[PDB]
Amino acid sequence: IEQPRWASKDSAAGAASTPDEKIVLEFMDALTSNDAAKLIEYFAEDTMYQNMPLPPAYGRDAVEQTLAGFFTVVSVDAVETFHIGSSNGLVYTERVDVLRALPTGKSYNFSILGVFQLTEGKITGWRDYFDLREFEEAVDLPLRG
Amino acid sequence: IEQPRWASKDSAAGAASTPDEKIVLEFMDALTSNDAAKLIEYFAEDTMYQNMPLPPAYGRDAVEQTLAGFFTVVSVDAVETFHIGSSNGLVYTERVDVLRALPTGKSYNFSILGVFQLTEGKITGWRDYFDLREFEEAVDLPLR
């Protein structure tokens, strides 16, 4: 993965300068664990996770069930974060996620802009925006959308 | 268009508090014009516009021709911005755009998170991240 031409080092991952920004970057790194039990500990009880516009998961239990199910069929092979920033209680990651489908071996680069809302350092909302055209094929599950 | 359960008034569009954030909202309200020539006045000469991951447009001419083409087959009927924010010289909009295809009259709700880079009050970069599964059918053009 090459740094796009629009990347700005003023907003680079290395330049994260708030506790919320730094926790999110740590959480980006943990995604390659493909461990739902490890990822869930970043989340408040009152939380939500959604890849738009698929049905949202609300509450810790639903978020963990969703992640564990995703890790059953896909491996997050790499997370490259070009931009991270924050504003008005929200954190934004502009990034690429490399996903590999386990039954097929095929790999997929997804360009993702994600928003995170943290409360006392725990994730209260997580929403990723990206194209789903190849997400259906990448993910051997009905996505209900 | 309903306000989502996750909407935070702390970052609502009515609370925009920088010049760059205020311009980006104005550009949001101007989208319903469907007028590439009124919209291009917002862009600097070195600029780019991309609906991720489609082939980007670099340079103000290419951005103009991309919008002009889009507005030939699609109307932007509404833009609701739930959140506007900014950080490290980038502005972010979490919003919904209602798009209507001209040849069919079918409408579509696109949930969109966009990032804007502005230099001297002019757009040097604009990337919208959203699901393009229905965008193929929405715009009567090859997506490449």
Swiss-Prot record, chain A:
Q: What class of enzyme is it?
A: hydrolase
EC number(s) on file = 3.3.2.8
Active-site residues annotated for this sequence = 97 (proton donor), 128 (proton acceptor)
Transmembrane domains' residue ranges: none
Q: What is the effect of changing residue 95 to A/H/K/Q?
A: Impaired protein folding and no activity
Ordered alphabetically, the record's keywords are:
Hydrolase
Keyword Disulfide bond belongs to the record: no
As for pH, the annotation reads: Optimum pH is 7.
- Look up the record and name the pathway of this protein: Terpene metabolism; (4R)-limonene degradation; (1S,4R)-1-hydroxylimonen-2-one from (4R)-limonene: step 2/3
Q: Which reaction does it catalyse?
A: limonene 1,2-epoxide + H2O = limonene-1,2-diol
Q: Where is the signal peptide?
A: none
GO MF, any single term:
limonene-1,2-epoxide hydrolase activity
Temperature profile of activity? Optimum temperature is 50 degrees Celsius.
**Induction behaviour:** By growth on monoterpenes.
Query: What the protein does?
Result: Catalyzes the conversion of limonene-1,2-epoxide to limonene-1,2-diol. Can use both the (-) and (+) isomers of limonene-1,2-epoxide as substrates and also has some activity with 1-methylcyclohexene oxide, cyclohexene oxide and indene oxide as substrates.
Q: How does it assemble?
A: Monomer.
Family per UniProt?
A: Belongs to the limonene-1,2-epoxide hydrolase family.
Q: What is this protein called?
A: Limonene-1,2-epoxide hydrolase
Q: Which organism encodes this protein? A: Rhodococcus erythropolis (Arthrobacter picolinophilus)
Q: Gene name, please?
A: limA
